[PDB]
Design an enzyme around this catalytic site. Structure first.
Site, PDB file in Angstrom:
ATOM      1  CG  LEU A 178      -1.675  -1.307   0.890  1.00 14.56           C
ATOM      2  CD1 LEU A 178      -2.492  -1.055   2.853  1.00 14.56           C
ATOM      3  CD2 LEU A 178      -2.457  -1.328   0.312  1.00 14.56           C
ATOM      4  CE  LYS A 180       9.188  -0.033  -0.466  1.00 20.60           C
ATOM      5  NZ  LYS A 180      10.461  -0.495  -1.580  1.00 20.60           N
ATOM      6  N   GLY A 182       9.232   5.893   6.785  1.00 20.10           N
ATOM      7  CA  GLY A 182       9.121   5.392   8.115  1.00 20.10           C
ATOM      8  C   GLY A 182       9.873   4.513   8.368  1.00 20.10           C
ATOM      9  CD  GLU A 185       7.213  -3.759   1.653  1.00 15.09           C
ATOM     10  OE1 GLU A 185       6.706  -4.081   2.045  1.00 15.09           O
ATOM     11  OE2 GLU A 185       7.295  -3.114   1.293  1.00 15.09           O
ATOM     12  CG  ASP A 297       3.331  14.580  14.165  1.00 14.61           C
ATOM     13  OD1 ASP A 297       3.355  15.101  13.310  1.00 14.61           O
ATOM     14  OD2 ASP A 297       3.450  13.486  13.090  1.00 14.61           O
ATOM     15  CE  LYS A 299       3.278  15.003   9.670  1.00 19.13           C
ATOM     16  NZ  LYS A 299       4.647  15.032   9.547  1.00 19.13           N
ATOM     17  CG  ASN A 302       0.725  12.084  10.440  1.00 19.22           C
ATOM     18  OD1 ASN A 302       1.176  11.476   9.702  1.00 19.22           O
ATOM     19  ND2 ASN A 302       1.256  12.519  11.323  1.00 19.22           N
TER      20      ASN A 302
HETATM   21  N1  LIG Z   1      -3.899   1.961   7.689  1.00 16.15           N
HETATM   22  C1  LIG Z   1      -3.230   2.718   6.786  1.00 16.15           C
HETATM   23  N2  LIG Z   1      -3.560   2.045   4.930  1.00 16.15           N
HETATM   24  C2  LIG Z   1      -3.783   2.506   3.892  1.00 16.15           C
HETATM   25  N3  LIG Z   1      -2.378   3.231   4.564  1.00 16.15           N
HETATM   26  C3  LIG Z   1      -1.560   3.142   5.255  1.00 16.15           C
HETATM   27  C4  LIG Z   1      -1.372   3.007   6.501  1.00 16.15           C
HETATM   28  N4  LIG Z   1      -0.991   3.410   7.786  1.00 16.15           N
HETATM   29  C5  LIG Z   1       0.201   3.636   6.771  1.00 16.15           C
HETATM   30  N5  LIG Z   1      -0.373   3.454   5.488  1.00 16.15           N
HETATM   31  C6  LIG Z   1       0.596   4.447   3.980  1.00 16.15           C
HETATM   32  O1  LIG Z   1       1.536   3.793   3.990  1.00 16.15           O
HETATM   33  C7  LIG Z   1       2.545   4.729   3.731  1.00 16.15           C
HETATM   34  C8  LIG Z   1       4.216   4.678   4.784  1.00 16.15           C
HETATM   35  O2  LIG Z   1       3.274   5.123   6.080  1.00 16.15           O
HETATM   36  P1  LIG Z   1       4.811   5.544   7.570  1.00 16.15           P
HETATM   37  O3  LIG Z   1       4.521   4.298   7.420  1.00 16.15           O
HETATM   38  O4  LIG Z   1       4.008   5.760   8.243  1.00 16.15           O
HETATM   39  O5  LIG Z   1       5.573   6.194   6.814  1.00 16.15           O
HETATM   40  P2  LIG Z   1       6.287   8.299   6.487  1.00 16.15           P
HETATM   41  O6  LIG Z   1       4.342   8.444   6.349  1.00 16.15           O
HETATM   42  O7  LIG Z   1       5.844   8.070   4.517  1.00 16.15           O
HETATM   43  N6  LIG Z   1       6.526   8.664   6.862  1.00 16.15           N
HETATM   44  P3  LIG Z   1       6.247   9.004   8.780  1.00 16.15           P
HETATM   45  O8  LIG Z   1       5.780  10.693   8.076  1.00 16.15           O
HETATM   46  O9  LIG Z   1       7.666   8.819   9.711  1.00 16.15           O
HETATM   47  O10 LIG Z   1       5.030   8.942   8.812  1.00 16.15           O
HETATM   48  C9  LIG Z   1       2.174   5.733   3.653  1.00 16.15           C
HETATM   49  O11 LIG Z   1       1.646   6.505   2.093  1.00 16.15           O
HETATM   50  C10 LIG Z   1       0.632   5.821   4.158  1.00 16.15           C
HETATM   51  O12 LIG Z   1      -0.346   6.643   3.632  1.00 16.15           O
HETATM   52 MG   LIG Z   2       3.131   8.588   7.896  1.00 16.27          MG
END
Ligand SMILES: Nc1ncnc2c1ncn2[C@@H]1O[C@H](COP(=O)(O)OP(=O)(O)NP(=O)(O)O)[C@@H](O)[C@H]1O
Ligand SMILES: [Mg+2]
Length: 529
Positions: A178, A180, A182, A185, A297, A299, A302
């Protein structure tokens, strides 16, 4: 009976009734002995516990009237403001008048008189809350104790036995990536037995270690577990793999709010959309704040959409549960989204989240952050300076009410900020920007989103291993990482697992008793396996 897809291509396991087969009641003795017999938890907060307690009550016409009342009060809360007088009068006549057959005597007549007087005046959605509490104070007594001795609580123990079964390599199946970022993935995944789709957030152990993110990863897990809100991503399972830790979360694949604000090409969207999103975000914040937990947080990245166009607050890593009566300190957040009291490193409460709400409403309508352009080369200390020393301006994109609520939330002094007073969220809900919004109906899911997203599709051919594996612990004299892995991986989370069973109709189909004599074989103590 609810379901929507993450793209669920396979349904329940053909063998799901075997996978989820009840233990014989004789195998629940340890559970019976160790379970905390707490009415609020067992009969209300835990969804299957609530359902089974109600099934018990409906066998007693003398308790059933209390359940009917509570259900009527639920109906009252979502009644249009203009019709509350009639609905309230109907409830009074039906339940709270001794003449009626469904009269409930355990609500004290002093409470009834209070309620009758409030009903004479301007009725509010919360009119019956004190009566409802009085009802639960009755039910937590002898009715609860009767319940604990019934076949319905026996059946609850069987469901609890199932709930606590370990997560294994066979629990899930894996679908596409979905997203990647943080620590890792996120991929789609599905519980084999129930067919329910989730997002699996895969945190790489090596990346957590390098960035010393253990306490934050653990914090996100622990807050996610304790918050149960329709507007915050829910955590259903937490487990370990060889290389990673997995959070199995509500799948929100509609795209994040940053994507949607800037997808337009004409950044910012219609006020009707921004209004709806802001209202749901506010409900999410209120739910966190009810746990005295400050998000910190907010924004657009999020905030995630689901396939229906509803939103949830995501990414709880910076959230903090504040000890009651206290204030906290730390300068944390994203540049451009941090409240002045955070930037100034003062002690603060829940107030930064209302500042954050203002940033979000502003950006959704303008298509740009209040204090920085999306294409700009600017030092973070300058962005900080703007937030502290300059006032944001408002284009023609803002209605008078939108400009007003943004200015009131973007109040730099936390003491005067909207939502930060005695009233808390109630003050924000009654703002003219929201004048047409019934928040009780919104909370209850009775309002359709104005916009339905295209499901997000990313190209990634990486498919990482999410199969549960419990690593051998203590291989090194320093076992701090291992302690963290053990602390993290607690398996299923009670309330979401129970909702999963209900939503997928595993509960409805599996929860059955004997025909008339009404004890099924799995509850029959005379025939153990
Ligand atoms: N519950 C979820 N369902 C679907 N996609 C998700 C979900 N949580 C996160 N994502 C997506 O997965 C990707 C990674 O999210 P995340 O692990 O939070 O890292 P990040 O947002 O890229 N960087 P960070 O600022 O550290 O949160 C992003 O495109 C999110 O939108
Ligand atoms: Mg994130």
């Amino acid at each position: 009976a609810r379901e929507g897809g993450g793209g669920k291509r396979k349904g329940k396991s053909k063998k799901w009734k075997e996978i989820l087969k009840f233990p014989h009641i004789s195998q629940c003795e340890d559970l019976r002995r160790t379970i905390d017999r707490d009415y609020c938890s067992l009969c209300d907060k835990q969804p299957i516990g609530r359902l089974l307690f109600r099934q018990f009550c409906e066998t007693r016409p003398g308790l059933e009237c209390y359940i009917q009342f509570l259900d009527s009060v639920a109906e009252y809360e979502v009644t249009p403001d203009e019709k509350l007088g009639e609905k309230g009068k109907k409830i009074m006549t039906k339940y709270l008048t001794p003449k009626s057959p469904v009269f409930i005597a355990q609500v004290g007549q002093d409470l009834v008189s209070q309620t009758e007087e409030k009903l004479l005046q301007k009725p509010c959605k919360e009119l019956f809350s004190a009566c409802a509490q009085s009802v639960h104070e009755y039910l937590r007594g002898e009715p609860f104790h009767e319940y604990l001795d019934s076949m319905f609580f026996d059946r609850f123990l069987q469901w609890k036995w199932l709930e606590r079964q370990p997560v294994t390599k066979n629990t899930f199946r894996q679908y596409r990536v979905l997203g990647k970022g943080g620590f890792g993935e996120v991929c789609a995944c599905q519980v084999r037995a129930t067919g329910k789709m989730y997002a699996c957030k895969r945190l790489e152990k090596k990346r957590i270690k390098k960035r010393k993110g253990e306490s934050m990863a653990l914090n996100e897990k622990q807050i996610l577990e304790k918050v149960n809100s329709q507007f915050v991503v829910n955590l259903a399972y937490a487990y370990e793999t060889k290389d990673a830790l997995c959070l199995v979360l509500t799948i929100m694949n509609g795209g994040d709010l940053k994507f949607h604000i800037y997808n337009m090409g004409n950044p910012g969207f219609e006020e009707e959309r921004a209004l709806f999103y802001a209202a749901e975000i506010l409900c999410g914040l209120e739910d966190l704040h009810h746990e005295n937990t400050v998000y910190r947080d907010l924004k657009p990245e999020n905030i995630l959409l689901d396939d229906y166009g509803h939103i949830r607050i995501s990414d709880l890593g910076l959230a903090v549960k504040i000890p009651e009566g206290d204030l906290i300190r730390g300068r944390v957040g994203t540049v451009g989204y941090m409240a002045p009291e955070v930037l100034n490193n003062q002690r603060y409460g829940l107030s930064p989240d209302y500042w954050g709400l203002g940033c979000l409403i502003y950006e959704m309508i303008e298509g740009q952050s209040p204090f920085r352009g999306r294409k700009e080369k600017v030092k973070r200390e300058e962005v900080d300076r703007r937030v502290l020393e300059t006032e944001e301006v408002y284009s023609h994109k803002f209605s008078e009410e939108a400009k007003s609520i943004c200015k009131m939330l973007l109040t730099k002094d936390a003491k005067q900020r909207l939502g930060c007073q005695e009233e808390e969220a109630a003050e924000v809900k009654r703002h003219p920007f929201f004048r047409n919004m019934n928040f009780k109906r919104l909370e209850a899911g009775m309002l359709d989103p104005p916009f339905v997203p295209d499901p997000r599709a990313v190209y990634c051919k990486d498919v990482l291993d999410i199969e549960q594996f419990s690593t051998v612990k203590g291989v090194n004299l320093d076992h701090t990482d291992d302690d963290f892995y053990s602390k993290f991986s607690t398996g299923s989370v009670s309330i979401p697992w129970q909702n999963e069973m209900i939503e997928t109709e595993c509960f409805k189909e599996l929860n059955v008793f004997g025909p008339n004599g009404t004890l099924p074989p799995d509850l029959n103590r005379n025939h153990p396996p």
